Structures are given as structure tokens and as C-alpha cells.
Amino acid sequence: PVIKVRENEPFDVALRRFKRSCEKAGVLAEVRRREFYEKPTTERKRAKASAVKRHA
Amino acid sequence: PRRRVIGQRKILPDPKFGSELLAKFVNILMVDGKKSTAESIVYSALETLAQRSGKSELEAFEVALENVRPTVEVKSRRVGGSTYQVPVEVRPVRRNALAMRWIVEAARKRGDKSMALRLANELSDAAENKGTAVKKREDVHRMAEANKAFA
Amino acid sequence: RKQVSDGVAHIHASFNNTIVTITDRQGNALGWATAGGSGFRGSRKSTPFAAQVAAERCADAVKEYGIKNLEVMVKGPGPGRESTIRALNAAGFRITNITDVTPIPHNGCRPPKKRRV
Amino acid sequence: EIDYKDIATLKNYITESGKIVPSRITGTRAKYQRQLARAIKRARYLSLLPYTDRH
RNA sequence: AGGCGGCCCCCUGGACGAAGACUGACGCUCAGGUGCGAAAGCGUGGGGAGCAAACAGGAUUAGAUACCCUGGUAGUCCACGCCGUAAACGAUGUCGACUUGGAGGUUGUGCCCUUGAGGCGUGGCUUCCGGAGCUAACGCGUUAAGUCGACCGCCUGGGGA
């Protein structure tokens, strides 16, 4: 994805935008779901465990 | 201090100089409550110190101190298991005592005849910050900056 | 060399390290540096200022081409991807916008099992 | 949503990188969001909503 | 029911919202009996990204046949069977009748100028609070763990098992 350079704009102002851009999903965080091997029973209860955590 | 806030004792002003800030130095130099001999140790040095100052005697004392003043120091966090050091700007009220306290502790580690030669030289050195104390702050100057992002 | 004035700093900010690569538009990488290839070992490799220093070491040896602009590549969570970009700020660079570069698998490989530590 | 041919409004359901935004943030009926995917993944081969900006 | 989620066609199948005809007990239960049947594995023909048993290498440890790290066989994906077992749980047999309540959701559907996303009924399912009641209590509590009708199923100290 193109992250383009404009005129007169310091690299610091986008610094906030840089992490905000991919934090929406998280490249390595979703990488966290291909690093090892997981049983689907994990996610389903992961959904189950996460589902319970999601009930304020 | 966890529940009760605390203050600092209002040490008496100098009998000869009449300075409270200079009072902590003698108390810092004061040992085993020897105010009888403590201020004489302070009184003698600047009189010799003034001779090798040219600029003045009482102000010469401050010029060397600014060289060793602790601007920043590290307060540990010790929460999770790694020895965290979160830096903080120290109030100069305690800073000067640290500045004065450190200068005193370095004179004892010298080979001259006496602290009159040792103390007179160190502050004269501290005037251009070339004594034991001034390098001590520089050492403190890197612990708060090498761990800067780790505040 | 060769004057380009428009480069590309691909920031790979790993959980242990933050590696950023300089490249041109076609993608032909011109330069590349790592936070962990910049001092820090083990724990210290994955620290922001470690990613910040990586940018210092990555930000140099890529303007020797006379690069004047360079589009950036965000990558994953971790210590870098924020300090590296900040150090890149130190040189007085320009950047229009920053766009997410995340490959979002739509239910691909079987997930990882948590480290039973 | 209803059809794959109107990618103009389909674009509000996609982030700038081509990954379909959660309808939860967009809202939309629970059934309606499904029609979005029907117009997106398969209709990909009709070039409706971009992958991302890589090439 | 397990179990079912990227998109399209065939077919299915089940399920509920409004009236109108149809026949009239043609109903519920079921030993035996009959089908299906989460996951893994295996047999057999393929496939083959991730990987990950077993199994190889590097670390801790006094020791670590493990946890920490690099590999890794099987297998996981398309075709025929077997195996038919699991926390297959709401720990809640099946069908029909009665019963304060409270508060939402969703799903039909009439009504109401929608006079506006609303107001007023008529069904289904379901979410949370709870009268009574009852329970060893725990709590359940109009989807009853409160009040009745039929069939089926089942238990008689602990271990051995």
C-alpha cells in the first residue's frame, strides 16, 4: 500500500498516522494467527471465551 | 511517607554568613553533630578558596556547585521483574543538597595534607568542574538518557 | 548514486526487532537496515529507540542516491513502526499519507497455539 | 450490497487496503452485509473492489 | 441433532403470518426392529500450503525422554467403507392440559391520518428480572426446578470395575 510523500510535510506529523494505519488490523497481531498451530476447538472456545468476555 | 506527607527541617542560618542554603552544606559537612568544628571546616576553605578564586570568595562557592548540581536522577519502578528506572526532574531544593553532599564526600578521597588542601582544591577544581564531584553528575547524566525512552 | 529523489522505506518492525528497507518505485530495494542489526541483542533488540536507532542507521546510506521523497511501508505491531518513523522524521522528510499494508487472510491457515509457558 | 455492479457504495464497506470493513462499524442489516461479500469475493473476477494498492 | 457461515444454479427439507374447503379420532407412546450419526484413525485411489505426533537438533535443570527454540513423519484437502464412540449439557425423557409478574430482541402479521422513524392487536422463537411455589440448599421459577393426563428409560454404600 502506497504511503506517499507530499510537499513541506514533516515525517513527524504522519508518525501518528503510520501506526494508526495498520493498527486497524495489526500486521503482526494477525501474524499471531499463523506463527503456530492451533486446534479449531481453540477458536470456537476462543470465540466462546472471547464471547463471554464481551458481555459487559 | 506512604500515608503521611513530609517536609524538610528549617536548619538555622549561618552564624557568620547568614545563609540557609549554605546551612545544609555545613550540616552535610556536619558529622556526629560537630557544629562546633563543622562550620570552621566550611569557614576556612573559602578563605583559602577566595585567594585562588580572584572573582570572589562567597560567590566562588556557588560557581563550582553549579557544575555538580543534580538536574535529573532515576527513581526505580521495580514492579514487574525488570529493574525499571523512571527518570524525574529533582527539585533543586533537594538538588543542591545532593550537589553539596556529593562535593563533600569526594574530598575525603584525596591525598593532600588535609581537607583544607583537599576541599580548597576540589571547589577550585569544581569552579572549572575538574574535581571528583563534577564527573559524578556526568555519570548520573547518562543513566537518565540511555534509558530515556524507558522512563 | 544516480539521483532518484523518490525512494521507499519498507519498515518491518518485528516483535524482536524492527527492520526497515529502502527501495525505489519498481520495488528494487536500494537500502535496508534493522533495529537488531544496530547494537541491541535479545531483549534490547525489540525496543522503540532500538527501532529509532535502526531508522538512524537505515535513514543513512539511502540518501547517498540523493533521494528526496520516499513512500513508507507500515508493518505489524511491536516496538518499531513508531520509533523508526520518528527517527526518519529527524532528517526533514516529507510524507503525504500512510496506508495500511496488512494482508488480511480470509480464513486461511489454521491458527497458532498459545505458548504453553 | 444488493448487487455487485454498484461498487460506488460498495466502497464504503471497504477500507483503503481492500479488506472489507466490518459491517458492525458500518451497521447495515445483518443479511444485507452478506450481499456485500457476494458482490465482492466472487465478483472480484469482475474487478469490483480493489485488492489493495501494491502494483 | 450432531452439526451448518466467502459467491452463484438443481433439488430438498424442514419451519412459522391472514382467511376459505377438505375427512373425520384416522391420536401419543415403542420392546424388538429400522436410519442417521461431533472429533481422531485406519483401509483403499489421489492430492498435497500450514504445518504438527511420533521422531532429529539446540536450551533449563541435579536431573527436564517436557515446558523455551529449528526441523520434523503421519495427517489435516478430492473418491469408496469401517469404525458409531465424546463435557453429542440447559448435567433438564417424550407428548397434552393449568398458572401472579416484570422487563427486552427478533421474526410474521391487522390495525393507526406511519398525520413521523411511531400508537393500538393478532402468532413463533428467544434474551434478562422475578410472585407463587418448591427445593438439602444452591435457585428455579409461564420455555417450571409450581398444579395434572399416557408411554418409555433408569438406580439401590465405597473400592474392586
In angstroms, the Cα distances linking C28 to B7, C4, C54 are: 65, 12, 20
| Deposited experimental method | cryo-EM
Count CA atoms within 13 Å of residue B45 on its CB side.
24
What one-character-per-residue DSSP string does C27-69 give? --EEEEEESTTSS--TTGGGSHHHHHHHHHHHHSSSGGG---E
- Cα(B150)–Cα(B133) distance, integer angstroms: 27
What's the gap between Cα D22 and its chain centre? 10
Rounded to 5°, the CA angle B29-B31-B36 comes to 85
Subunits with 3+ C-beta pairs closer than 8 A to A: C, D
Q: Is C108 on the interface with A (CB under 8 A)?
A: yes
Full domain range(s) for residue C116: 1-117
Residue B64's closest CA among B147, B124, B137, B138?
B124
Residues whose CB is less than 8 angstroms from the CB of residue B106 and which lie 6 or more positions away in sequence, other chains included: B122, B131, B132, B133, B136
List residues bridging with C8 in a β-sheet.
C23, C71
What are residue D18's DSSP bridge partners?
A: none
Task: Check if the beta carbon of residue B74 is closer than 8 Å to that of residue B147.
Answer: yes
Taking CA atoms, B96 is separated from B16, B33, B121, B135, D20, in Å, by 20, 21, 20, 16, 61
Lookup: cell for A16: 501518528
Residues with CB under 7 A from strand E: A 34, 36-37; C 106, 108-110, 115-117; D 34, 37-38, 40-43
Taking the Cβ of residue A18 and every Cβ of chain C, the question of whether any pair is shorter than 8 Å is answered with yes
Buried b (16+ CB within 10 A) or exposed e, A22-52: bbebbbbebbeeeeeebeeebeeeeeeeeee
- C-beta atoms of D53 and A2 within 8 A: yes
The reported resolution of this PDB entry, expressed in Å, is: 4.2
SS (H, E, C) chain B: CCCCCCCCCCCCCCCCCCCCHHHHHHHHHCCCCCHHHHHHHHHHHHHHHHHCCCCCCHHHHHHHHHHHCCCEEEEECCCCCCCCEEEEECCHHHHHHHHHHHHHHHHCCCCCCCHHHHHHHHHHHHHCCCCHHHHHHHHHHHHHHHCHHHC
Handedness of CA B30, B34, B36, B40 (dihedral sign): negative
Residue A11 has a CB neighbour count (10 Å cut-off) of 24
Backbone torsions φ then ψ of C58, nearest 5 degrees:
-75, -40
**What residue of C is the nearest CA neighbor of D52?**
C101
Q: How many Å apart are B29 CA and E115 C1'? A: 93
Q: How far apart are CA C31 and CA A37, in angstroms?
A: 34
Q: Count interface pairs A-D at CB distance under 8 A.
A: 8
Q: Which residues of C touch D41 (CB under 8 A)?
A: 106
- How close, in Å, is residue C26 to chain A by CA atoms? 12
Cβ within 8 Å, pair C83-B149:
yes
Pairing state of beta strands C69-73 and C6-13? Answer: parallel
For residue B2, the tally of other CB atoms under 10 A from its CB is 3
Amino acid identity of B126? A
Question: Can you give the distance from the CA of residue B47 to the C1' of nucleotide E40 in angstroms?
Answer: 94
CA-to-C1' span, D31 to E21 (A): 38
| B79 CB within 8 Å of a chain C CB | no
- Rounded to a whole number of angstroms, the distance between the first and last alpha carbons of chain C is 50
Q: Which chains touch D (3 or more CB pairs under 8 A)?
A: A, C
| Separation between Cα atoms, residue C23 and residue C69, nearest integer Å | 11
Per-residue DSSP letter, C112? P
> For residue D45, which nucleotide's C1' is closest to its Cα?
E7
Q: Quickly give B62 CA vs E107 C1' distance in Å.
A: 85
Whether A31 and chain C come into contact, CB under 8 Å, resolves to yes
For residue C95, the chain A residues in CB contact (below 8 A) are: 3-6, 9, 11, 14
d(CA B11, CA A20): 55
Q: What share of chain D is helix, strand, coil (3-state, %, to 5)?
A: 50, 5, 45
Domains: count for chain C: 1
Say whether A50 sits in a helix, a strand or coil. Answer: helix
